[PDB]
């Protein structure tokens, strides 16, 4: 469907293995998406990639210790997105002339 989704995490690093969980979660979530803010990623995925990422990521985090939220906008994401500061991000609809 090629729809834009956004993922936020919040892992407790004061536990026994918080640092390793943070590292694995960040590494796994960076593969499927592009970082826009600290602990806030956005990506363009279908239903299949979204389901695969959700299944992969629900096994790395530990319940009753972490938080993870996933939002989806839709095919019209170009309207419901606003940037005001000085942290630009690459748009995956650009011809990408590097």
């Amino acid at each position: 469907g090629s729809m834009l989704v956004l993922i936020t995490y919040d892992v407790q690093t004061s536990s026994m293995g918080g640092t390793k969980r943070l590292r694995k979660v960040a590494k796994a979530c960076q593969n499927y998406g592009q970082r826009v803010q600290n602990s806030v990623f956005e990506c363009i995925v279908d239903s299949t990639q979204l389901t695969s990422l959700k299944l992969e990521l629900t096994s790395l985090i530990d319940e009753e210790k972490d938080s993870l939220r996933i939002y989806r906008l839709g095919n019209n994401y170009k309207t419901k997105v606003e940037h005001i500061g000085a942290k630009p991000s690459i748009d995956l609809e650009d011809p990408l002339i590097f």
Binding site: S2, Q30, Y32, G33, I44, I90, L92, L96, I97
Partner: protein, 342 residues
């Protein structure tokens, strides 16, 4: 029902491509220029002296991503070929349909039919929409003659004749092409479709489009599990990578010439973007090439409808689909390959 994916263009020289998990990262003297996910990327094209890690090459090869190295003005060099993934029956059928004149002349009949139909209807549409700028009468006559050839194209059974017919189909159209231009005639020295490998201005766009189309069709053909640059249609002469051009002869007359003609007519390109070398060759400035690539991608973005069922589709999906059907014909589903007709 597949969806189009973006394409990554590398224009800066002395770059380096590296793999990090499922991400491609650009380096230029140990600084991170940018990283892109590889799950929404279809091909990688590099200009100048670009290097790539073998791990990235293997990753792209086994996940159907086409790497390409080019030189200055889109000169083809060192395509990254992959492996064999099985599907022995389809490959054997493709290689057995060859070296036999009957099925070869049937499929060549279909290809030439598509090409001539597309060219004739393109010229007819053009002389329809503006009559005042050009001379309609000649066009009609020309179109009429092509119609006759169409019928003769159906009534042939030997590969030797069609090539000659192709020559006629080549010489009956060039005279029209020269009077296709409407604006910037004096600035762009436009000699029709006259072509020289040394390049003589108002041909860099055509050559660049041909190279991009050849690479795209080669990648799309390798995606489905067969190879069609030297095979059951085109000449057995080595060095003529024109079957990948032949499967898109239904397209190269339309999909690239139309793009170049629209670029000329819509005032989108100025004569200052070209310059001439000391030896006489013509080269394009970097800004002109960037504008050409942006226009190419923008044209690829917008949607059309397939004549068969009416499903919405993109231009970049036109080759892949036209390859996929060629697979299903080889399995006996259809009577013969139904070409692309507008």
């Amino acid at each position: 029902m597949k969806k189009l994916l973006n394409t990554l263009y590398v224009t800066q020289p002395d770059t380096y491509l590296s793999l990090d998990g499922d991400n491609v990262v650009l380096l230029k003297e140990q600084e991170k220029l940018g990283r892109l996910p590889l799950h929404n990327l279809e091909a990688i094209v590099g200009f100048g002296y670009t290097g790539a890690s073998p791990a990235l090459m293997g990753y792209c090869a086994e996940r159907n991503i086409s790497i390409t190295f080019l030189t200055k003005n889109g000169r083809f060099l060192a395509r990254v070929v992959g492996e064999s993934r099985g599907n022995v029956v389809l490959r054997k059928t493709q290689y057995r349909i060859s070296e036999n004149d009957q099925e070869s002349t049937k499929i060549a009949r279909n290809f030439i039919t598509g090409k001539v139909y597309n060219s004739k209807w393109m010229l007819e549409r053009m002389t329809r929409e503006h009559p005042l700028r050009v001379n309609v009468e000649q066009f009609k006559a020309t179109s009429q003659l092509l119609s006759v050839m169409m019928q003769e194209i159906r009534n042939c059974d030997s590969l030797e004749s069609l090539r000659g017919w192709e020559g006629q189909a080549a010489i009956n159209y060039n005279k029209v092409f020269d009077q296709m231009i409407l604006q910037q005639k004096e600035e762009f020295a436009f000699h029709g479709r006259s072509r020289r490998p040394p390049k003589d201005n108002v041909n860099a766009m055509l050559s660049f489009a041909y190279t991009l189309l050849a690479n795209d069709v080669a990648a799309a053909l390798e995606t489905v599990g067969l190879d069609a640059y030297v095979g059951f249609m085109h000449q057995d002469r080595p060095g003529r990578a024109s079957l990948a051009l032949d499967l898109m002869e239904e397209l190269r007359g339309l999909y690239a010439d139309r793009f170049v003609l629209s670029l000329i007519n819509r005032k989108e390109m100025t004569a200052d973007g070209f310059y001439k070398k000391e030896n006489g060759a013509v080269l394009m400035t970097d800004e002109a090439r960037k504008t050409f690539l942006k226009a190419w991608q923008t044209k690829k973005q917008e949607k059309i409808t397939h004549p068969y069922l009416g499903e919405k589709m993109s231009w970049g999906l036109v080759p892949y689909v036209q390859a996929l059907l060629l697979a299903r014909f080889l399995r006996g589903d259809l009577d013969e390959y139904p070409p692309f007709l507008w």
